Symmetry: D2
Subunit: 386 residues, 4 copies
């Protein structure tokens, strides 16, 4: 069962299934894929759409006539399959010119180039129908303390994002930006290393409403953080504009395993949260089929991303709908967590002897939270052991 | 040399030098210290002041007459020594009533109690002259996914901080709040786990100007993050209201080693940043003399916190003042990082062929950043090997 | 379903369900349990037996008559319930005398005391029928580099274990030792930090056959290691004498969550390995019911340890027995991994042109490993989604 | 000062200074270096020698005549400069044929090829004068649990190392092997992930005396382990055959920073240990000049490796020779740690009432260890602040 269809809004980057398998220590294990072929194969699996960096769709340094032909062929594949392009992004990390950054490169000429490269691809993104434009500043950061003054770098990063906001406003485009945090890799430390840092930065932009976050499962887990909690804070802020789904085993290099691999229970709680909250954006996979795999394994790994999401969706929904779980949630006071602490106001709280002078602290301390029974019901639902 | 004096603004929590050595696996190794004795010993070492949780100064459950006598004795010790009290905080973590949180406990009665307990100690803090009131929500969080809906918890945390802001405004107090992030420990995951998450949260409070952060070296390092970078983002935001200095060896339990221990180069870059930026708040140590130590070792460890700060301050200042370093900084384009990317404006950037059509990407890529020579000058200055 | 019975050989430490909830930052949340009550409650749940540190069964400093009465009551509870005592251990970590270690304390008198304390409890262990005597040297290590010369400490640790081996041989006891590694906590770094380090150390003891390892899920995961892989190396070495089962979320303080919590897929692969290998020792839980819980939650958490093991056992067995999985294992060459590389011998390998001169490296490189399809069959079996 | 000369025995891999800067997310930033040029430049800096993988010296797939000419040119550069070749190794990780391993590949034909490739280069290593032959099994491991049975893989790894030992014995070569552990990267988990695991494995080889370890600073730190402690255990075992020096910031991708970068205090304690122990092998750097650098920065980074070792050597020697430190070491009972616990024997210990019945546990517990004063003397010596 668990068959995806385009209604499920699953999307994939061209660079995911198209990854040829080069790693720090290894040459490619697979031939390059034509984007047309990836669009056709992903549609066959039941994907809704694809995403791209500029340089995945149009080789870097292409002439205008080559650019036009690459876009024409890609548009034909989209039209042949019904696939969409909900998101696009810029490659500001592969070319050696970006070795110290794009928007926060120490060289000013590089910063200006990075902005022009981005702007060119925003126009293309809009042409192809994208609603979201991601920015992963993977080269923004440092290996050493003197190399990068972070206050100056944040000034440059704000100028860049503000210019991009002025550009989209000037053109009357509806597209919005999603900043993707990552704590490290390829830089020793990356600027805006977590969802929190990116959310905080956005509040200092001139038009914050144009910007949200694009969190990635594995990135927050590279800092040992709880990905569902970070997603909850992004949702609380109204800033979950896009999301990248994959798997990661804790604090390592970025593994980009298929979704559901890595921390399975975190995957369960993530799906539970997205579905509970009614997140309506793409469920995008930013993953890499391991380099051990041939093309059959690439498509199996892609299919597994979607299958795992659908299994988890079923189990999370069954958990929340189970009367026994609903009673356990009330036994654990989840209902009381959702009630205001002091809707009666400050002065009433100050005058309330039940809140201090007559609060029986020992009686309250003795009341168990019943969280372990609740969590074992969650385990039983995930495992199909009810 | 490197002798601290009160002008250096070094402060210590009562709970630091007063830690009796109990850990997850171990009983106390030292007798309790009277706060009067810690104030006298810290003053002898050249400290400027001390800080307290409510329950470090006044045992939990004290009568009004006991409270008054504890405060009277402490005030006498302050007056005898010239020590100040720049910061105070609430213990919302030790008593079993707070096992699921204070401000975000699932039990509403506990949330209301936590607020009353905090308010009582804000009044005391102001009496004692404190400018900053720290809040470390160490119990806010979860060990399991169903136990805590994070959006609801953030709603409760905002209500609590907003009520506290209304309280201080109503009283005409000048005190400001500093929220202390930590990623985990004692909860499996703590809410507001990093500086970024706390900065982002503050922007959603009703009176954000009343709130900043109190980052701790070891807390950000428990997420593998770069503490100087996070401090730079807090400074960029205008939110470094207080800071906690200590040492930590990476991703472990919170070690609370003396400042300078743990990541020494991060300590160097931190001091460089605080001094460069002209941070004018207390240099507060939140550390624990290891439980291996007797009282002589407690005071040696405290003295070492201050000594290490002063050594690092000298070395960072020598680095920045060295003409050879100044030339290396220009060779690495730190000066260009500090210049606006496009003060000429968006349309000029769009019309600038030097930024795209005529940008020689290969020439720019070939220019080395010279960061390793710069970093070895920094190493040589730190080690006194110039 | 998934009901444990004593035949399943599930065991629990007295200190697990008996943990009162004290943590670095918190007082006890539960009253102390009488060991008699824990034996009765665990038997009711279907446990096979219990384990103890000396000081969990007999309070430290007890008189001979108090000792005798504590043991008499415990033996009655064992006899009333049919519970066994397969393992015992020494507390060489709680009392302040052990603040720098037991066997590797810098103070020689402490080292000698630690040995006498251990020997006294080996005699008790044997009286109670234990086959395995665990040693977790949680205080062996350092917070600073000068405090502990590790070569000298390893000399002292070998002398201690050798003396213990001489003691058991002298008495004609059948009991064997199991050394429990942990990388850190409560010491900044603990000696013998992983399964590998402990296995290597054992090979240098005078009677290595008397010693094996007692790995704990969460301990190896505190170093980011793969617990099933480490168990496989222990099994390969013939040294898995005992095992501690629990849950952990990666690189943090030691969480001691119930088994199945933390890394669920690692729990699956662990059970698969133990069952495949025919491990016949106790399935022992070294866990802590979270301090949020009352006693009902303690017993629910304990029951969940056993339930999760039994669910995982069923799913792992179904995976290995599924003809589709068996075919996927052959497609991924797991059968070839189990065949000798060169049973033909060195000279034949050297003369084999198919191994070098005529090896078609490109054809071999092109053959996919089919690991993603295999892993998604494993996921489907774990989740009950076949 | 701190000028290295060949007497210092500093060595570098060709792949270190020759790294062109390709990373997971980035193309090369530097042109390829001819090994002849690296030998000349390293000699100019005061290096003693160089090391190589087969494929760094002779491009993969070279003809016999190309092989001979590459070796001839390299030998001329060695002879021109006086540089040595103390160590060599095999590249069993870059070519796609090794995507599942060399010695533990699931495909048997690949395992046999990996052995022939290694044997060919052992002969070359011996020709060039190498004493040590390193093996880093970077592809040995898995991303998923079903893909690799670790007991079977360890059987294959033992067969491979045993065959290599039979080969060197058959040829009468004096060369010995050094196994290099790493916990992860490029595989999700690597087999023999730490020094301990490798030491334990070696004890099960047929001729253990032929094998030791080649630990790398950053590899053990990728597991959060204490590198000096692991080196001490290797020295204790008599197995430190070679060492790789670099820098790493904790639990991340393998950074390969220059030695002294990353954890500076760990670098200090490492040098202290190597020098104290009289380690006489090469001080080999396995590092990567950051891709931000041009060739001038490559040579500056290489020079900094050696400079930092020499600074640390001076400071560690001054620490150990300082009478004040010597007295602090006795105050902390480091002398007592080095004395046998019970040279009087088991029966005397059992009969010694001072070890149990008459041991004043409270008096011993009250004696402070004085470790913080000792560690601040170590800090002061490292920083040149005495
Ligand atoms: Co990623
Ligand atoms: Co991504
Ligand atoms: Co802390
Ligand atoms: Co703090
Ligand atoms: Co544990
Ligand atoms: Co244990
Ligand atoms: Co490395
Ligand atoms: Co290496």
């Amino acid at each position: 069962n668990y068959q995806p269809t385009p209604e499920d809004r699953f999307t994939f980057g061209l660079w995911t299934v198209g990854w040829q398998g080069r790693d720090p220590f290894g040459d490619a294990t697979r031939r390059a894929l034509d984007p047309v072929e990836s669009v056709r194969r992903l549609a066959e699996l039941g994907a809704h759409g694809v995403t791209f960096h500029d340089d995945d769709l149009i080789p870097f340094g292409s002439s205008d006539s080559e650019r036009e032909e690459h876009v024409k062929r890609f548009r034909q594949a989209l039209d042949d399959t019904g696939m969409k392009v909900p998101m696009a992004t810029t490659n500001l990390f592969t070319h050696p010119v970006f070795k110290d950054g794009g928007f926060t490169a120490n060289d000013r000429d590089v910063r200006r180039y990075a902005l022009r490269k981005t702007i060119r691809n925003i126009d293309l993104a809009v042409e192809l129908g994208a609603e979201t434009y991601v920015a992963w500043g993977g080269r923004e950061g440092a290996e050493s303390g003197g190399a990068k003054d972070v206050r100056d770098a944040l000034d440059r990063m704000k100028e860049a994002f503000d210019l991009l906001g002025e550009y989209v406003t000037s053109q009357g485009y509806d597209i919005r930006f999603a900043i993707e945090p990552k704590p490290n890799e390829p830089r020793g430390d990356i600027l805006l290393p977590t969802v929190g840092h990116a959310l905080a930065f956005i509040e200092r932009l001139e038009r914050p409403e144009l910007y949200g976050v694009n969190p990635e499962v594995g990135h927050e887990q590279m800092a040992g953080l709880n990905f569902p909690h970070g997603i909850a804070q992004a949702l609380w802020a109204g800033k979950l504009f896009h999301i990248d789904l994959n798997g990661q085993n804790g604090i390592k290099y970025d593994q980009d395993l298929r979704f559901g691999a890595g921390d399975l229970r975190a995957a369960f709680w993530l799906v539970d949260l997205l579905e509970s909250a009614g997140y309506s954006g793409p469920r995008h996979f930013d993953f890499k089929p391991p380099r051990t795999e041939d093309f059959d394994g690439v498509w199996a790994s892609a299919a597994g991303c979607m299958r795992n999401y659908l299994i988890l969706k079923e189990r999370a929904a069954a958990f929340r709908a189970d009367p026994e779980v609903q009673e356990a949630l009330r036994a654990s006071r989840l209902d009381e967590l959702a009630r205001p602490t002091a809707a009666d106001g400050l002065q009433a709280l100050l005058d309330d002897r039940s809140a201090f002078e007559e609060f029986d602290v020992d009686a309250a301390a003795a009341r168990g939270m019943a969280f372990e029974r609740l969590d074992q019901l969650a385990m039983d639902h995930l495992l199909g052991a009810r």
